Amino acid sequence: VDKSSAFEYNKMIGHGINMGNALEAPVEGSWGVYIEDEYFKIIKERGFDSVRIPIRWSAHISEKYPYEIDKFFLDRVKHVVDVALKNDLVVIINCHHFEELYQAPDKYGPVLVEIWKQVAQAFKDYPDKLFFEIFNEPAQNLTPTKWNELYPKVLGEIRKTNPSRIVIIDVPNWSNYSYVRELKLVDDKNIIVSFHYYEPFNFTHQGAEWVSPTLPIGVKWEGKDWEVEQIRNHFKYVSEWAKKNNVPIFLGEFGAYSKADMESRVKWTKTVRRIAEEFGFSLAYWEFCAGFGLYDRWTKTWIEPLTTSALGK
């Protein structure tokens, strides 16, 4: 009962949640979310295994080479990781919302490499329950090809100081399930591949004003046979690819915006969770609070049964 290490670490992700709209804002708090230490105790008590923390490193570095991360910001992230590990959560820290990387990856890929050299150096001695995640949702001009070229350079710098730490590699083109086949792997035994799931997009993003054109509301999701089979077909495609490529899969984000009717949200979330479990995917719901949120910060209570849909208990 030799077992693959990466697959075992992926199981440690288990059922997780994203602590979003916070450190990936230009300044934490400017989108209305600020991470309280108590949040991690709350998350763990509810029964989540892990937390995924979006971080806009690129908003907190020197303007010139080698792009030193601002001390105050690195200290903040270290504090937040410390508290989550203190509450016995597995923690995934990423880089997120690097707008210039999406537009000019030839110019800004090297900046990502330098960010990661620093973050890896800073976290090198942290327990193995901290995982790194090179970049959220490659897309736009960071095409599958450019990403396949870039992420191994970043991984190389990470591996200098963190030879075995789990590093999560995102599927390109916004991490949409269907682009899994465009991802080229490397010979590294401590990687996990991640995709994000928001289909039907006109359901999960109805009424979201940041989408162009804003999509009509009133779109239902009813748990009919055909609706469930659409999701199963999608996740089967990822599962067959992952088995062929000998790599574990983390469904790093999934969720339906609050402008969707609640019963639909509850049914969709539960179905996605069950189908991810059926294929052996770990998973993180998007997100703790804000527009897709499970936790009502005002009442200091979980929204139910939506939370149970995401977590399964």
Give an overview in words:
- This protein has 313 residues and is α/β, with parallel strands linked by helices.
- It has a single domain, classed as TIM Barrel, CATH 3.20.20.
- Helix content is 40%, strand content 13%.
- It has ten helices and ten strands.
- The chain has helices at residues 5-13, 37-46, 71-86, 99-103, 105-123, 144-161, 201-204, 225-244, 262-278, 306-311; strands at residues 15-18, 50-53, 90-94, 130-133, 167-170, 191-197, 249-254, 282-285, 295-296, 301-302.
- The protein has an eight-stranded parallel β-barrel with strand order 1-2-3-4-5-6-7-8, surrounded by five helices. Strands 9-10 form a two-stranded antiparallel sheet.
- α5 (105-123) packs parallel to α6 (144-161) and α8 packs parallel to α9.
- It is globular and about 50 Å long.
- InterPro entries: GH, Glyco_hydro_5, Glycosyl_hydrolase_5.
- Its EC number is 3.2.1.4.
- It holds the Pfam family Cellulase.
- Residues 27-289 form the Glycoside hydrolase family domain.
- One of its GO terms (molecular function) is beta-glucosidase activity.
Structural class: alpha/beta
Give the class-level CATH name.
Answer: Alpha Beta
Shape-level CATH architecture: Alpha-Beta Barrel
* Terminal Cα span: 29 Å
- CATH superfamily assignment? Glycosidases
From N to C, what is the helix and strand string?
HEHEHEHHEHEEHHEHEEEH
